[PDB]
Design a protein around this motif. Sequence first.
Motif, mmCIF file in Angstrom:
data_model
loop_
_atom_site.group_PDB
_atom_site.id
_atom_site.type_symbol
_atom_site.label_atom_id
_atom_site.label_comp_id
_atom_site.label_asym_id
_atom_site.label_seq_id
_atom_site.Cartn_x
_atom_site.Cartn_y
_atom_site.Cartn_z
ATOM 1 N N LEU A 24 1.018 -1.190 0.115
ATOM 2 C CA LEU A 24 0.043 0.024 0.038
ATOM 3 C C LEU A 24 0.748 1.358 0.094
ATOM 4 N N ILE A 26 2.372 2.640 2.789
ATOM 5 C CA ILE A 26 2.020 3.477 4.127
ATOM 6 C C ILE A 26 3.030 2.662 5.084
ATOM 7 N N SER A 27 3.133 3.276 6.278
ATOM 8 C CA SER A 27 3.542 2.600 7.678
ATOM 9 C C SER A 27 2.508 3.295 8.663
ATOM 10 N N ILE A 28 2.022 2.405 9.405
ATOM 11 C CA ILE A 28 1.256 2.759 10.585
ATOM 12 C C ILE A 28 1.999 2.698 11.859
ATOM 13 N N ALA A 29 1.233 3.484 12.646
ATOM 14 C CA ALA A 29 2.094 3.442 14.060
ATOM 15 C C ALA A 29 0.678 3.591 15.201
ATOM 16 N N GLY A 33 -2.520 -0.081 23.923
ATOM 17 C CA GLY A 33 -1.229 -0.804 24.511
ATOM 18 C C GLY A 33 -0.017 -0.095 23.868
ATOM 19 N N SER A 34 0.158 0.554 22.778
ATOM 20 C CA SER A 34 1.430 0.846 22.388
ATOM 21 C C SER A 34 1.431 2.376 22.724
ATOM 22 N N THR A 35 2.672 2.997 22.644
ATOM 23 C CA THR A 35 2.807 4.485 22.644
ATOM 24 C C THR A 35 2.202 5.294 21.682
ATOM 25 N N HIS A 79 -2.447 -2.670 17.847
ATOM 26 C CA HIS A 79 -1.472 -2.482 16.558
ATOM 27 C C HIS A 79 -1.672 -3.340 15.591
ATOM 28 N N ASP C 1 5.726 2.209 27.141
ATOM 29 C CA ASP C 1 4.829 0.974 26.299
ATOM 30 C C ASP C 1 5.663 0.890 25.025
ATOM 31 N N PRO C 2 5.380 -0.131 24.467
ATOM 32 C CA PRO C 2 6.247 -0.638 23.091
ATOM 33 C C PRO C 2 5.869 0.394 22.128
ATOM 34 N N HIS C 3 6.755 0.863 21.342
ATOM 35 C CA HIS C 3 6.351 1.910 20.233
ATOM 36 C C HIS C 3 6.359 0.935 19.003
ATOM 37 N N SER C 4 5.302 0.967 18.196
ATOM 38 C CA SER C 4 5.049 -0.104 17.160
ATOM 39 C C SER C 4 4.937 0.711 15.881
ATOM 40 N N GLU C 5 5.604 0.171 14.913
ATOM 41 C CA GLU C 5 5.596 0.729 13.579
ATOM 42 C C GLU C 5 5.732 -0.368 12.498
ATOM 43 N N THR C 6 4.797 -0.477 11.488
ATOM 44 C CA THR C 6 4.513 -1.514 10.676
ATOM 45 C C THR C 6 4.587 -1.014 9.122
ATOM 46 N N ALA C 7 5.338 -1.326 8.113
ATOM 47 C CA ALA C 7 5.185 -0.890 6.662
ATOM 48 C C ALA C 7 4.328 -1.977 6.067
ATOM 49 N N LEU C 8 3.421 -1.267 5.241
ATOM 50 C CA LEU C 8 2.434 -2.287 4.481
ATOM 51 C C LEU C 8 2.529 -1.460 3.029
#
Lengths: 102, 102, 8, 8
Positions: A24, A26-29, A33-35, A79, C1-8
Motif C-alpha cells: 500500500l 504506508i506505515s502505521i503506528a 497498549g502502544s505508545t 497495533h 509502552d512499546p513503540h510499534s510501527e509497521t510498513a504495509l
Amino acid sequence: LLIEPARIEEEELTLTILRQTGGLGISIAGGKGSTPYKGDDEGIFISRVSEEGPAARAGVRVGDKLLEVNGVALQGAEHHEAVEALRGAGTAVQMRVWRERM
Amino acid sequence: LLIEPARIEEEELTLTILRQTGGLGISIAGGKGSTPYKGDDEGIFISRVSEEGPAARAGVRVGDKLLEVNGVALQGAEHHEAVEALRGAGTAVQMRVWRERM
Amino acid sequence: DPHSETAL
Amino acid sequence: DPHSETAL
C-alpha cells in the motif's frame, strides 16, 4: 483590517487505495497498549506515506488517523489487529480517516 | 472499472461573518428541549441562509451545525441561549460549525 | 509502552 | 416538543 478566511479545521474522508504488488505504500503506528503516535490518543495513525505510491495517489497523508478499513472498525484496535486488517484487505483498500489542519 | 475518488464525509470549519446593519443573514433551528432539526440531534443548526448575505459570503451553508460562537460553546444550549449568543456577538461573528456531505 | 510501527 | 426557529 484582514478577516480570517473560511478554514477547515478537521475532516473525515473516505479514501480508496488500489494495492500494487509492492503493498500500500504506508506505515502505521500506534494502537491500544502502544505508545501514542500523537498526544494521548492510542488510535492507529499513518506515520509514513511512500512518495507516488498507491496510498499517496489515493490522497492518504502522514498523520491521518485510520478509523475503518473495508467495513472493519479500528476503534480499540491493538497495533497487530490494524496490521491484520490492512494486510488482508485485498486489492481495493477503502479507508475512513480523520485528518486535522497542520 | 471505476474507483471511488477521495471523498470528504464531514468537516469542521471556522467561519467568520462580518455582521451588516441587516443582521447575519441566517436562521437557526433546534436546541435542547426543542424538536430536533435533524435526526434526534438537539443541537443548533443553520436552517436558512440569505442569498449573498453576510453568512453566505462567509461560507455558511444550510444544515451546518453550530458548535461555538466567539469562544462560547453551544453544547447543551437551549434555542434562546444560542439566539442570545449570536445576537450579542458583535461585528465579527466567528463560528465553529460541523458539516456533512449532502 | 512499546513503540510499534509497521510498513504495509 | 416546540419547533423553534429564529432569523438573525
